[PDB]
Amino acid sequence: MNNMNVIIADDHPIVLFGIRKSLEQIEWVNVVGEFEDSTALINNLPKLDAHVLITDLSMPGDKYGDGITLIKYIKRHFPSLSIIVLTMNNNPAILSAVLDLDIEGIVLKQGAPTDLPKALAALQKGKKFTPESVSRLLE
Amino acid sequence: NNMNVIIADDHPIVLFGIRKSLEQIEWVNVVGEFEDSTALINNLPKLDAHVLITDLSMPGDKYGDGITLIKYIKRHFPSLSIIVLTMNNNPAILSAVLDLDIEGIVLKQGAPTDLPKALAALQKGKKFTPESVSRLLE
Ligand SMILES: [Mg+2]
Numbered sequence: 468m469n470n471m472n473v474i475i476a477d478d479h480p481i482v483l484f485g486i487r488k489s490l491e492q493i494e495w496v497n498v499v500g501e502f503e504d505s506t507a508l509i510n511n512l513p514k515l516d517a518h519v520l521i522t523d524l525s526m527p528g529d530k531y532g533d534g535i536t537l538i539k540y541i542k543r544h545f546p547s548l549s550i551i552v553l554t555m556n557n558n559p560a561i562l563s564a565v566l567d568l569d570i571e572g573i574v575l576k577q578g579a580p581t582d583l584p585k586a587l588a589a590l591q592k593g594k595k596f597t598p599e600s601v602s603r604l605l606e
Numbered sequence: 607n608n609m610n611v612i613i614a615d616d617h618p619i620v621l622f623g624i625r626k627s628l629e630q631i632e633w634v635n636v637v638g639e640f641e642d643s644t645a646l647i648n649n650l651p652k653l654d655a656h657v658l659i660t661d662l663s664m665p666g667d668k669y670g671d672g673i674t675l676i677k678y679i680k681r682h683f684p685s686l687s688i689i690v691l692t693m694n695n696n697p698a699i700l701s702a703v704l705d706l707d708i709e710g711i712v713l714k715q716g717a718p719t720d721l722p723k724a725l726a727a728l729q730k731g732k733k734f735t736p737e738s739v740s741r742l743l744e
């Protein structure tokens with residue numbers, strides 16, 4: 468596939484290792500940055516020239532925040548950047564509000580082990596990789 | 607001394623991270639990976655494990671999870687060393703888990719080197735607690 472500069476952002480290092488373990492088989496991926504905090508993510512985002520961001524939803528960093536506020540900030544300040552949300556919060560209202568921000572993918576940590584590789588493969592082909600929130604939201 | 611390790615976490619990405627961390631440790635031998643407590647307990651006897659790196663919150667209605675599961679493993683597999691790997695930052699839960707006489711805790715919020723340090727302590731015949739744990743415990 469086309470070569471891709473990836474930044475990964477999660478406040479759990481073991482999750483960051485897990486992303487690297489899953490992506491080490493994929494040669495076209497270049498992990499140009501790893502961050503545990505949204506301040507360090509935003510300060511480094513201009514300097515790295517990244518095509519994709521694999522971001523955690525619940526994260527420390529008071530200056531730029533986390534979740535919806537952070538994704539809203541990133542898309543307004545870094546419009547070329549593609550965002551894959553990696554979260555364990557599968558709440559219908561949070562997933563749908565995240566979907567309304569026009570992001571490229573959501574991967575649940577509760578889901579299948581091959582979802583994060585498959586989401587990057589979908590992004591390369593210009594397609595979406597997201598779970599449906601509305602049915603559970605409506606309940 | 608070589609040590610067979612089983613790991614238990616209900617997020618596959620966490621299991622991948624634990625394996626990636628344990629690549630660097632050559633006297634560790636990852637011998638099983640499990641996403642629930644039922645599959646863990648059913649496979650525990652046939653694997654000849656010396657150490658178990660286990661998550662606190664997992665699915666499993668048969669043998670339960672957290673403090674119930676740790677208690678089940680210590681009574682039925684007393685030779686097994688248990689390292690608890692949790693994102694729970696509640697002093698009551700961590701103190702209750704420590705009172706079971708487990709070999710070590712690792713916080714998912716803590717330092718990247720805490721899991722390697724836990725195993726290094728365990729190889730020298732000692733228990734381990736991160737600074738993140740000892741700071742919040744009172
Ligand atoms: Mg988080």
Ligand SMILES: [Mg+2]
Nearest residue numbers: 616661663664
């Ligand atoms: Mg869990």
